[PDB]
From Swiss-Prot:
Na(+) 2 binds at T307, T351. It holds the Pfam family SDF. GO terms for molecular function: amino acid:sodium symporter activity; chloride transmembrane transporter activity; identical protein binding; L-aspartate transmembrane transporter activity; metal ion binding. Residues 260-288, 337-371 dip into the membrane without crossing it. This is Glutamate transporter homolog. The chain crosses the membrane at residues 11-29, 41-61, 80-102, 121-159, 196-217, 230-250, 297-319, 391-411. It comes from Pyrococcus horikoshii (strain ATCC 700860 / DSM 12428 / JCM 9974 / NBRC 100139 / OT-3).
Length: 415
């Protein structure tokens, strides 16, 4: 009885109730010194929610790209393929430098007290540029899928989808029949994961309550007291300028920006709370069909950008890099400035759709400039931003969904 009424209630309204209620509970318990109780009991519910999101990432990226590539003729795929990737990279480059310019302009936040605390080990070492490019080709298609390789999975999935299109045009009857059966089985898998995503989203209000309450109990209230500069800079930076960057581009091509945000408003809110771009992928598909985009375009452009187009994460890479540098007191000249821009674009590509990938992947960007994590002072500052990661995680996922959706609208208008 009561279980049913909990279901028909709209999902988005439930999340805001959980997020707001979680905020109140965390502050009260933290003030009375019950943080230890929250860590032992409340936290495990939040941990389960995170593990559910990581489960869906790989079965959905492989299946969606195979179906997306197989639904476009090879001639049309080349034209849309080159245009979508160039938009993705250029906005990524602009996103990194946008954080760079105002980080110098805004207060760097050098003044901070640090303690050794916990230390990270084995800092991520950057291989030579030729080596990371040759690793896109999977030496074992099954091994890359099982061993948590994302970039090789995309490379193999796209080729497999293109090869199926050639088979469905073959003269032999047996070849066509077997090619259709293979595509249907993969398509059925892709549709199944969308149903599981809806099922997981029903547990999200409980999961968001645990994750949010845990933050303020330990250190969440400290954002206003200290480190207000780093949290304000990303919010004044990532949210504001990039949304109007979308506004001007749509105006140039003749599309009204205010109509775009109204139709896609639900996409940002679901990405704001669940922290996963891949988890919100089915919602973006629902938005696209109502907007009027043809089926062939967004069926392929949207899945590809869920792992490639991540402007929010790229911006976050630049601002956090200076925060580590300012804490150490070191100074970076233009030579390190260029290296940050290049590595941040590469680093944003390597991240997956899981929420917490931003912090772990950031080791590549810092190591390129220097200051390895073996330094306890570097580790001390690095281990601190992990606490405020959850609050800043929400901003990064939100804009990435719009950045993916913005490109499809621009591209689809061209044809
Ligand atoms: N969850 C982000 C990635 C990150 O936060 O590192 C995204 O997929 O857009
Ligand atoms: Na981009
Ligand atoms: Na990525
Ligand atoms: Na994205």
């Amino acid at each position: 009885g009561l279980y049913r009424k909990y279901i028909e209630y709209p999902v988005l309204q439930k999340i805001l109730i959980g997020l707001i209620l979680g905020a109140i509970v965390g502050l009260i318990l933290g003030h009375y010194g019950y943080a230890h109780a929250v860590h032992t009991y409340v936290k495990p519910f939040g941990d389960l929610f995170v593990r559910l999101l990581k489960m869906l990432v790989m079965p959905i990226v492989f299946a969606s790209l195979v179906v997306g590539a197989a639904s476009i003729s090879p001639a049309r795929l080349g034209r849309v393929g080159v245009k979508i990737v160039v938009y993705y990279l250029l906005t990524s480059a602009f996103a990194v430098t946008l954080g760079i310019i105002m980080a110098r302009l805004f207060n760097p936040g050098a003044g901070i007290h640090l303690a050794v605390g916990g230390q990270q080990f084995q800092p991520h070492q950057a291989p030579p540029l030729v080596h990371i490019l040759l690793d896109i080709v999977p030496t074992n298609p099954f091994g890359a899928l099982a061993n948590g390789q994302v970039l090789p999975t995309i490379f193999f999935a796209i080729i497999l989808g293109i090869a199926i299109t050639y088979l469905m045009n073959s003269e032999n009857e047996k070849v066509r029949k077997s090619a259709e059966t293979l595509l249907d089985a993969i398509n059925g898998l892709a549709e199944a994961m969308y149903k599981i995503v809806n099922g997981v989203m029903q547990y999200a209000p409980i999961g968001v309550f645990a994750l949010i309450a845990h933050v303020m109990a330990h250190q969440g209230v400290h954002v206003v007291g200290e480190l207000a500069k780093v949290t304000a800079a990303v919010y004044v930076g990532l949210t504001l300028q990039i949304l109007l960057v979308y506004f001007v581009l749509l105006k140039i091509y003749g599309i009204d920006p205010i109509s775009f945000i109204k139709h896609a408003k639900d996409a940002m809110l679901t990405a704001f709370v669940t922290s996963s771009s891949s988890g919100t992928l089915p919602v973006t598909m629902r938005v696209a069909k109502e907007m009027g985009i043809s089926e062939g375009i967004y069926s392929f452009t949207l899945p590809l950008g869920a792992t490639i187009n991540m402007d929010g994460t790229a911006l976050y890479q630049g601002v956090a890099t200076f925060f580590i540098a300012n804490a150490l007191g070191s100074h970076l000249t233009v030579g390190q400035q260029l290296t940050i821009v290049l590595t941040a674009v590469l680093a944003s590509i390597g991240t997956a759709g899981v929420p917490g990938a931003g912090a772990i992947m950031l080791a590549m960007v810092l190591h390129s400039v220097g200051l390895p994590l073996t330094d306890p002072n570097v580790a001390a500052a690095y281990a601190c931003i992990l606490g405020i990661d959850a609050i800043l995680d929400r901003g990064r996922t939100m804009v990435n969904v719009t950045g993916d959706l913005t490109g499809t609208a621009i591209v689809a208008k061209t044809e």
